[PDB]
């Protein structure tokens, strides 16, 4: 759920060229005030009480006014009834690979699954907008990657299962492609290839090419290493490294 603050490229008549608040949810860029009104909010007053700013700036209020204008121009009478949910459904359904579930249920298991109510995830959306506006107004520092507060390390509980899963996804694809040829004119220990995981794990341990965490190809190098056996201090500091 990526919420950006950039200029209005969509529907730009070369005059209204100020910043606007748009989101990136399920590969569909909708304005944030349509997503506010689609979940519980029925007025602009309680939509501004959720985004508690408590400041005096001209780049925040003008951006909020531009977001309200781009929400009222892209959808007619979106602040009355349920016209925002139709636009949300049509924006997700126009994607290249849309989910087969209904859009009234996609906002309950994809948009903030850690929360239960449909009105609480609108308050969390308002809190997320409030943090972005406070970071844009200079009252909040951005997250730096050099600090260990925003960093988590993975030794074997996430590095090994993410290589187990990319081999299980191949073992589950080499099973249906061999059971489809023997179904339309057998034990269960014939289609499940047991060596396709072992030959993948041995190759990943030998070559060092581990699976990328945000990709499928382009395997990274520098995850596993050999131990030094010249003195017990080298093998002690080799088990005490973080890259």
């Amino acid at each position: 759920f990526i919420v950006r603050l950039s200029e209005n490229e969509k529907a730009e008549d070369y005059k209204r060229r100020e910043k606007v608040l748009t989101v990136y949810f399920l590969s569909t860029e909708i304005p944030v005030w349509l997503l506010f009104f689609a979940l519980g909010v029925s007025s602009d007053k309680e939509a501004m009480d959720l985004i508690a700013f408590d400041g005096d700036d001209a780049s925040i209020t003008n951006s909020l006014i531009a977001s309200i204008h781009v929400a009222d121009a892209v959808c007619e009478a979106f602040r009355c009834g349920n016209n925002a949910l139709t636009y949300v459904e049509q924006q997700i359904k126009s994607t290249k690979f849309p989910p087969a579930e209904s859009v009234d249920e996609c906002l309950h298991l994809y948009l903030f699954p850690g929360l239960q109510s449909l009105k609480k995830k609108a308050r969390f959306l308002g809190y997320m907008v409030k943090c972005l506006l406070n970071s844009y107004a200079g009252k909040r520092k951005c997250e730096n990657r050099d600090s260990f507060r925003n960093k988590r390390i993975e030794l074997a509980g996430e590095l090994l299962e993410r290589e187990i899963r990319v081999h299980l996804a191949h073992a589950r694809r080499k099973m249906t492609r061999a059971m489809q040829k023997h179904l339309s004119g057998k034990p269960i220990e014939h289609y499940l290839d047991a060596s396709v995981i072992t030959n993948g794990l041995s190759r990943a341990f030998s070559t060092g090419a581990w699976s990328h965490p945000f990709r499928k190809m382009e395997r990274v190098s520098g995850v596993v290493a050999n131990l030094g056996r010249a003195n017990p201090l080298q093998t002690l500091i080799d088990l005490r490294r973080t890259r």
Partner: protein
């Protein structure tokens, strides 16, 4: 910690903020920052010392071990709470700081030939 009671937390030791190869170096905050980085990283992995207490189940490409390994005379807290004698790989020699006929120029070393054939630094 003793005089001001305004902390509500305390550390065990200040030398435990370093690695296992850096907290065993004596006078580590007295040396230059570029010179301790050599000893704690490169010189600790190349120092020939203990190898194994069982060289019969080990068939590694190359293994080296001194005949008479020695623990140092000083006692760091890491080597005192770790109880590991293999953290130091070398022998302590009587080191003098003097010129010897210009044979120690440009970071050279003049060593005793009679002591090296008695068991010192033999691997």
């Amino acid at each position: 910690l003793k005089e001001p009671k305004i902390y509500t937390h305390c550390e065990l030791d200040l030398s435990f903020l370093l690695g296992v190869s850096c907290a065993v170096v004596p006078f580590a905050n007295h040396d230059h920052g570029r010179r301790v980085l050599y000893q704690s990283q490169k010189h600790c992995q190349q120092a020939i010392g203990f190898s194994s207490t069982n060289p019969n189940i080990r068939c590694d490409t190359l293994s080296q071990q001194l005949f008479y390994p020695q623990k140092p005379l000083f006692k760091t807290l890491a080597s005192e709470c770790l109880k590991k004698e293999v953290l130091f790989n070398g022998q302590n020699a009587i080191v003098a700081v003097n010129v010897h006929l210009g044979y120690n120029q440009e970071d050279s070393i003049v060593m005793n030939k009679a002591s090296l054939e008695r068991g010192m630094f033999r691997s």
